[PDB]
Amino acid sequence: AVNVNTNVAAMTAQRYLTGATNAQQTSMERLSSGFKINSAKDDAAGLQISNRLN
Amino acid sequence: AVNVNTNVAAMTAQRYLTGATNAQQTSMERLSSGFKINSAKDDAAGLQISNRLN
Amino acid sequence: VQSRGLDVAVRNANDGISIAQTAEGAMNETTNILQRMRDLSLQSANGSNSKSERVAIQEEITALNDELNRIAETTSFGGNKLLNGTFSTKSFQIGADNGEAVMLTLKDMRSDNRMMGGTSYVAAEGKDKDWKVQAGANDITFTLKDIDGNDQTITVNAKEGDDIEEVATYINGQTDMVKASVNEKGQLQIFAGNNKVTGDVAFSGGLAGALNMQAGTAETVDTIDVTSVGGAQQSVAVIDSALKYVDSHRAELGAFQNRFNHAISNLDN
Amino acid sequence: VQSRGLDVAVRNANDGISIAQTAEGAMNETTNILQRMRDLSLQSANGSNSKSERVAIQEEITALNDELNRIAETTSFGGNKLLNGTFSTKSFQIGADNGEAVMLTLKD
Amino acid sequence: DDIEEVATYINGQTDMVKASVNEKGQLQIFAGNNKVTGDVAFSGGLAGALNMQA
Amino acid sequence: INENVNASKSRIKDTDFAKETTALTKSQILSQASSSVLAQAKQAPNAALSLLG
Amino acid sequence: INENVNASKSRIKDTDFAKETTALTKSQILSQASSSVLAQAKQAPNAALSLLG
Amino acid sequence: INENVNASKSRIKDTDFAKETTALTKSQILSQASSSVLAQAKQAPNAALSLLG
Secondary structure (H helix, E strand, O other), X not given: OOOOOOOHHXXXXXXXXXXXXXXXXXXXXXXXXXXXXXXXXXOHHHHHHHHHHO | OOOOOXXXXXXXXXXXXXXXXXXXXXXXXXXXXXXXXXXOOOOHHHHHHHHHHO | OHXXXXXHHHHHHHHHHHHHHHHHHHHHHHHHHHHHHHHHHHHHHOOOOOHHHHHHHHHHHHHHHHHHHHHHHHOEEOOEEOOOOOOOOEEEOOOOOOOOXXXXXXXXXXXOOOOXXXXXXXXXXXXXXXXXXXXXXXXXXXXXXXXXXXXXXXXXXXXXXXXXXXXXXXXXXXXOOEEEEEOOOOOEXXXXXXXXXXXXXXXXXXXHHHHOEEEEEEEEHHHOOOOOHHHHHHHHHHHHHHHHHHHHHHHHHXXXXXXXXXXXXXXXX | OHXXXXXXXXXXXXXXXXXXXXXXXXXXXXXXXXXXXXXXXXXXXXXXXXXXXXXXXXXXXXXXXXXXHHHHHHOEOOOOEOOOOOOOOEEEEOOOOOOOEEEEOOOO | OOHHHHHHHXXXXXXXXXXXXXXXXXXXXXXXXXXXXXXXXXXXXXXXXXXXXX | OHHHHHHHHHHHHOOXXXXXXXXXXXXXXXXXXXXXXXXXXXXXXXHHHXXXX | OHHHHHHHHHHHHXXXXXXXXXXXXXXXXXXXXXXXXXXXXXXXXXXXXXXXX | OHHXXXXXXXXXXXXXXXXXXXXXXHHHHHHHHHHHHHHHHHHXXXXXXXXOO
């Protein structure tokens, strides 16, 4: 049913784009700092043990 | 969201780049000087002990 | 309505991850400053350092203390301060309907926050270099109520014939709830992290009798003084307790982010 | 009448697939949250982790748990909640004549 | 706390008044008409020391 | 703080090209559609002439 | 101890460039794909006008 | 003093390519996009003649 008011397909692609874009940022960030865990969201337990090991 | 008026990725990369630049300069001094405590910023207490020993 | 509502919800959630990200970032620097202070404290402990050396270290520790407080009283999100404690139990609606909100609590990160410290009990009888654990008087009893209220009784039987300093090391090894340290006079001190032990520790046993432990004074990072070896050893513990508090808050925020990220994905689908 | 009824039936069935799509999609995130929990569990299990570490892991676990309950009490099709238990055993008439309905049940 | 720290703390505790310090080291409290209407009755022991003026 | 603040400001003010580009493309379609319908509409009265014959 | 502790800290905090770089590469490729299909997607409504006014 | 002063002068005067090179790129992409929108805009008025004419 060719429709103009809605392009669900576009929404699907944009959703996956946002997924891929955020992925790049996360990786790039890790590469720049050289640290896998740069925030608790990366690994709370690591943040804890790594800070304590530090 | 493939936005253009912002690039936090770059801002993050730069923050670490600066960190590295300063760290490079910091060690470069020590290497040229031959002294780890080049400025009071390092081991303020050592400065006092070193000077008193010197 | 639902579609438009879901859109607004995604935004609301993005605001949530943003406020959290800023707070987490501030706590990062907080951690670094605390670590510096801890190291300076250990340097102060070494007997080589004379009062003048400790005075120098204290000056830096005073500065970093102020910097910690500054970060807490300045970190803001467009004007709403996030670390001074004002922001508290704020709800971040992340749904296309009323009531779907998820709560978020930012704890005060000031250097005087009761959590960023504990209680310090110091002995009354100083033991000279020639004092050794006396046989039969080598028992120290730690009766405390943990943090969940669950009561625990740590029973440390000191090794016979050990110096006051070794006594502390032994305790530090036979438990993690209390931390021991010997002051200049030899008066053993016991720091109890508010995060770990709650209420009041009770010291019983023959060794306890010989030490004559006194009452506990509330100690926070804001109250640390490395001008005296005793203060230096105590500070190391106070900073350690804080480092925990800080990391704990960061970890919770970590999940808050992960959860809100997950909500965004579900919301868009 | 058959032609008109067939049209409405196609529409009703489209709605059916729509409800299933919404529910299935929500369960996609449900699965990811659970898998994250599984990895965090395997982490806590490792002996090196200390009690303090386990506490931290639990915090993330607890948050994810609430998210599963949030997704369960929120996923909706215009106010008609789907994966919470309230929606169950609903017939979808996909036939022009009456008594031609496939049954769908959304589990809690 | 130093007079500056007093101002920062005050700025962190309230939004109605914004505090600052002049070169002489005298605390300056500003109140926006958009937020505060009329005068501001400073009171307390610290105000007794600071001696806020008109 | 500046980095996170800048990122936040983005979410509230930046333009999501992905979303806006699709919106522009959609707007143009509806536009060309309406134009075609309008043209067809203007011809409606032409019918009468035949009836008047 | 310090040596082993540092090694232990790395395993939990270090960035394995090998895997990370590979990931970033994949991420960029995925992004380019999404962008390409997004382009084709925006053209969907074009069919309508082509179909008729 | 010379060394420290030269360091100070840099912060206030020398340009940081890190930010500058980025700022240039941003301006370039925005300009390229702006012109693209401008091209679309130039064709917009064509609708009247193209259809109602």
